[PDB]
């Protein structure tokens, strides 16, 4: 069973780069599409972006290209960098593995535990 | 060649009919040569039969960017076989470099049976 | 951006009730919708993908219908562990957008 | 079946050797049946042999998004054959729905000869 | 021979949407990748973005996602919308057809005549 | 963003000279470089693609070499119609970036 675990700070200062990591144990972070999805506290889910180890990365245009997602296959790590955060970036972030059913799907079957980052 | 086959068959068993038998033997030899040619081209990888899409995530599958080929390269053969679901992303599996047709037949037989 | 609307914002249901949650896409998503279940303080759980295909391990009481652009999640018998927030995702086009979330209450 | 073929051959021309001849006839019949099976599967489109990448822009070619398949669809067969140059974008050509192997052979013969 | 011809205003006001059109005659605007490339007067070429009729569109991140490119196959037209232009958007814009050599290439073999848009 | 540097910014050459223009990529572009020629008031003309493949209709006097990450455009005999600005494009990765332009002068 793939186990995703988020890590990073929870006290990211305003106008600073938000750095998050997702360690994937019990599997390989390659061979799959991996997305970052954020949920503000008390609000709905908001998809940040996807990436494949052997491919490119897709981002949500609502983030205005201030988000970079990367994959470290050596460490089985999924890194998220949200630059120039405001108070609106206070959210619980999930790394999610994309469903595979005879092809890569844009669904998230395995989710990380979710790490809450507060911008203040 | 047809004369040798006819002689061998007669030896095993022991005028227009002889011509018809020779023509039939020649047709059979041509068909066998076509089979051998197809098998040989399958061995060299000149038959790009698509491998089936795996049911689970595999090292083979990946985006179309996994299909990198050289800029100088002018090969007419597709590098991968891809499917793009309406539901998700482009999934590409490379064509086997050798025995692509035989490997496809094995995969199809395993899946169907 | 495909707007994903949900109805209603909250469902007041008891144990053993036919619970329905409606989702609507701004434009047709070619049955590329998923239903996720999220409990308080937990990550969402993929219940249904492709708007009709139940997830492996998910109880069969969940069903998904795709009548037109209006998708529906149906729970035949609302178990006490089924009280959560249900989100509908579109997967046809990027960016992937979720629904507002239907909080099934007591 | 082998007995009928042996009788026909003897009529045209006119104990372990008979057994060997029957075995050879049965092997030939099995090979011909395999050819017929391959041709039939080629007709139904169950052989996904890749069409060659066209030398010029064609209506067939397009991005991997041209490879749209249904979300409900669980087909094991790749929809397209794609190449991704290091030099440019992913180019995908759909596999023929019928006679994919024969069409590929015709294209390969036309290009090579 | 494919003939690309640009059209649009040359007096786009600041903080306004810049709209440009590229009519492709002697061919089909489908089946090919088409890019917009801008060159400020006296400066070097700057690639704005590509699009395929049967695919998605790729944009230059330096434009901060304020650029939209579209294809009208009915009119054989290639439309460019650069929102919120400044004095830096004064440039000659070219619509360019991507080279095809046994696959889609990121090279521009046929270029439009180039339309100069001044932001002032 | 792959930085594309050109050398020199201007070449002073006469008719019938071996003219060289150097381009350098910030990171290796796997021979995915092109050379374009642009005349004053005209659109660029694709001279060479893939750093060595001459374009159809382009005179054979143009050549492209790809020694390492350092690419080179070479003109054997500088015709009077060859005086223009030469740009090097990388095509390996997005966004596609051009060189600064080498203006071959008199």
Task: State the pairing for strand pair C70-75/C4-7.
Answer: unpaired
Q: Which residues contact B111 (CB under 8 A, 6 or more apart)?
A: B52, D76
Q: How far is CA B66 from CA A56, A76, B49, in A?
A: 10, 19, 18
Is the CB of residue A70 less than 8 Å from the CB of residue A59?
Answer: no
Q: Which residues of B touch C96 (CB under 8 A)?
A: none
Q: How far is CA B8 from CA B12, B19, B31, D14, in A?
A: 6, 16, 19, 16
A57-71: string of b/e by CB count within 10 Å (b at 16+)?
A: bbbbeebebbbebeb
CB hemisphere CA count around C24 (13 angstroms): 5
CA distance F30 to F52: 12
List chains touching F (3+ CB pairs under 8 A). Answer: B, D, E
Three-state secondary structure of A73-96: CCCCEEEEEECCCCHHHCEEEEEE
Q: Which residues of F touch E101 (CB under 8 A)?
A: 49-50, 53
Q: Which of C34, C35, C92 to mutate to test the interface with B (most CBs of B within 10 A)?
A: C92
With vertex at residue A59, the alpha carbon angle to CA A55 and CA A63, rounded to the nearest 5 degrees, is 160
Q: Which of E55, E102, E105, E106 to mutate to test the interface with B (most CBs of B within 10 A)?
A: E102
Residues of E near B (Cβ–Cβ under 8 Å) read: 101-103
CA distance E106 to F93: 9
For A23, the token pair is: 């360690």
Q: Which residues of B touch D86 (CB under 8 A)?
A: 68-71
- DSSP 8-state class, residue D49: B
Residue of E nearest to A65 (CA): E64
- Token pair 């051009």 in the structure block, residue: F98
Residues of B near C (Cβ–Cβ under 8 Å) read: 86-88
Q: How far is CA C72 from CA A47, A101, B40, C94, D89, in A?
A: 22, 22, 55, 22, 38
Q: B101: left (phi > 0), else alpha (psi -120 to 50), else beta?
A: alpha
Helix axis angle for B17-43 and D2-13, nearest 10°, is: 130
Q: Which residues contact D75 (CB under 8 A, 6 or more apart)?
A: A102, B53, B83, D69
CA distance F78 to C94: 50
End-to-end alpha carbon distance in chain C: 33
Nearest CA to B69 out of A59, A62, F32 is that of F32
Smallest Cβ–Cβ distance between F49 and the set E35, E49, E105 belongs to E105
In chain B, beta strands by DSSP E: 68-69, 80-85, 91-94
CA distance E31 to E27: 10
Q: How far is CA C33 from CA A109, B19, B87, D71, D74, in A?
A: 13, 69, 8, 9, 16
A109 by Cβ neighbours in 10 Å (0-12 / 13-18 / 19+) ranks as buried
Reported for C51-56, long-range contacts at CB under 8 A and 24+ positions apart, including other chains, are C51/D71, C52/D72, C53/A101, C53/D72, C55/A109
How is E12-78 classified by DSSP, letter by letter?
Answer: EPTTS-EEEEEEEESS-SSSSEEEEEEE-TTS--EEEEEEETTS-EEE-GGGTT-EEEEEETTTTEE
- Minimal C-alpha gap between A106 and chain D (Å): 11
């Amino acid at each position: 069973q793939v186990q995703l675990q988020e890590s990073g700070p929870g006290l990211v200062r305003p106008s600073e780069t938000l750095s998050l990591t997702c360690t994937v144990s019990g599997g390989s972070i390659s061979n799959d599409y991996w997305s970052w999805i954020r949920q503000p506290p008390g609000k709905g889910l908001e998809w940040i972006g996807q990436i494949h180890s052997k491919g490119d990365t897709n981002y949500n245009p609502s983030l205005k290209s201030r988000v970079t997602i990367s994959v470290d296959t050596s460490k089985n790590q999924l890194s998220l960098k949200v630059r120039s955060v405001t108070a609106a970036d206070t959210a619980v972030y999930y790394c999610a593995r994309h469903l595979y059913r005879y092809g890569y799907r844009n669904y998230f079957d395995y989710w990380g535990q979710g790490n809450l980052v507060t911008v203040s | 060649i047809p004369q040798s086959l006819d002689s061998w068959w007669t030896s095993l068993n022991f005028y227009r009919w002889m011509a018809l038998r020779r023509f039939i033997i020649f047709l059979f030899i041509l068909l066998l040569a076509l089979i051998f040619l197809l098998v040989l081209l399958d061995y060299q990888g000149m038959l790009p039969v698509c491998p089936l899409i795996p049911g689970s995530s595999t090292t083979s599958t990946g985006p179309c960017r996994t299909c990198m080929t050289t800029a100088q390269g002018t090969s007419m053969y597709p590098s991968c076989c891809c499917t793009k679901p309406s539901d998700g992303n482009c999934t590409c599996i490379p064509i086997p470099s050798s025995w692509a047709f035989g490997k496809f037949l094995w995969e199809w037989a395993s899946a169907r049976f | 951006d495909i707007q994903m609307t949900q109805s209603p914002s909250s469902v007041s249901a008891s144990v053993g009730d036919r619970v329905t949650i409606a989702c609507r896409a701004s434009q047709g998503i070619s049955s590329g919708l998923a239903w996720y279940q999220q409990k308080p303080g937990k990550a969402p759980k993929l219940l249904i993908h492709a708007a009709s295909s139940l997830q492996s391990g998910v109880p069969s009481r969940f069903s998904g219908s795709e009548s037109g652009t209006e998708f529906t999640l149906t729970i035949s018998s609302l178990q006490p562990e089924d009280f959560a927030t249900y989100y509908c995702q579109q997967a046809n086009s990027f960016p992937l957008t979720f629904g507002g979330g239907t909080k099934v209450e007591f």
